[PDB]
Amino acid sequence: EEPVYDATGKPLFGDPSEVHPQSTLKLPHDRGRGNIKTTLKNLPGNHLGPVSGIYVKPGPVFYQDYMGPVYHRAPLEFFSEAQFCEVTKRIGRVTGSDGRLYHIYVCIDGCILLKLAKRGEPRTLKWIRNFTDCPLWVTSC
């Protein structure tokens, strides 16, 4: 099971793992003045308040700051292969729970998708299950 982490950077269970050096999440980094929601077009303070980066969970729900536990790596246990989406918006580069670098997208239908950053696995993965209701910290400001 992939850990979630508190705002202090400590995992709530299990062991910590490093994020990929080329992820758009750079740690350590503070966060959590509030749970401040945003939208894809308002993706990053700004007019909505404090910004610590980009966070996303299935829904889709986006935040620009978040106080509760978050994933530092995409929990691949909760992703499944899905179909190629022709209309996507790339939002960052995330570490998978497998330690590899993925590009992360939001599809025009609202689905959160990953593609492996390195060539060789052309498939699209989709975040199917919002099991813990914790967002993924995609990028830090």
The reply to whether 47 sits in an annotated binding site is: no
Catalytic entry in 29, 47, 72, 103: 29
Q: Which residues pair with 61 in a beta bridge?
A: 57
Of 42, 66, 61, the residue nearest 137 (C-alpha): 66
Which amino acid type is present at position 29?
H
Q: End-to-end alpha-carbon separation of the chain, Å?
A: 27
Which amino acid type is present at position 101?
L
103 is catalytic: no
Give catalytic residues, as residue numbers. Answer: 29
Residue ranges of the binding site for Zn(2+): 29
Residue ranges of the binding site: 29
